[PDB]
Amino acid sequence: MLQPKRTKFRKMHKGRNRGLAQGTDVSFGSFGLKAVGRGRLTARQIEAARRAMTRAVKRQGKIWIRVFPDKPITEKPLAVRMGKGKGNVEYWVALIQPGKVLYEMDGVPEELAREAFKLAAAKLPIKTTFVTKTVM
Amino acid sequence: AKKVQAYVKLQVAAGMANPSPPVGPALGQQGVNIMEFCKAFNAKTDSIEKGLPIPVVITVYADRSFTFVTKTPPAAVLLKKAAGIKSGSGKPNKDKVGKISRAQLQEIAQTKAADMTGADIEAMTRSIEGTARSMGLVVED
């Protein structure tokens, strides 16, 4: 599980998730798993999907996780009233918008990249698509 | 031979007679005789040289048991008779386990012409060196 090594403040406000994404082209690799839905992704979903990919295209290839969590999500325990402070940091999510290339892959044929990205897009909560490295 | 009518191919190293541990009733399930691997088969084995299994066609007729003629010496123990260690291949091609001189394969390939596919010497030369590719046997050029 991914999590920043050392923050600056422990608890972040909710804020909103509007507009489109910045990481949009397949930059590092050759094939990409790009988001279409909005959503947000916990570190467990990123790890689950990465294990599905790494298993699927065996220890050949090279995989880039282009998103990183760095946003702490706090929850209140059970049978605790409202108020009395902000909750506790339970997990860490990355906020996703439509357009984020969530993962990249290189060093495989395209048909294995289709296969691993299908296998791993079923571990994520957002609708997802397959993209290739377009040249300009 | 004909349509498949009770002929199979099975035994182990035929320096001895009638292998009881390895196969046994595998040569007794069909109409193939138990006795005709023991005396007459070794009578037809001593015509060239012993110490080789023979995958052979045994066409069981309405005769006593059948009639048999051994035809070709197979290339498994012919490519194991001088190859390297006596244990086996395992993973033979990713390293250098065996090595075979190609002149003796040119003369054995020049001998064997019945149970092959080829009409030229060079056409069937590297086929048996394809069996050297099988057990990882590095040919000495």
């Binding site: 994404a21 949009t24 439509p98 357009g99 300009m136 | -």
Partner: protein, 94 residues
């Protein structure tokens, strides 16, 4: 070797461009050299199947606008974020 038939955009801004992409076209511009920049509207499907090739981004293109021919080269393409379609293309004269 590519011939891309174009028209001149009499309207511009985000209203007119988004109206222009719902009608299965997309805006574009031809700038470079000493001339004024030229706002251009392009059919979408022709240019999308055309840019699926690699030679679209390397070879000199020819854009036919008002019965002229401007030999341009595809400078920079804005693509839609999550759909296989185009927002806009910058064409530098050549």
């Amino acid at each position: 070797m590519f011939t891309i038939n174009a028209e001149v955009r009499k309207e511009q801004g985000k209203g007119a461009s988004r109206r222009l992409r719902a009608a299965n076209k997309f805006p574009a511009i031809i700038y470079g050299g000493k001339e004024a920049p030229l706002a251009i509207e392009l059919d979408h499907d022709k240019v999308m199947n055309m840019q699926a090739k690699a030679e679209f981004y390397s070879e000199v293109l020819t854009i036919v606008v008002d019965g002229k021919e401007i030999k341009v080269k595809a400078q920079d393409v804005q693509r839609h974020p999550y759909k296989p379609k185009l927002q806009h293309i910058d064409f530098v004269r050549a």
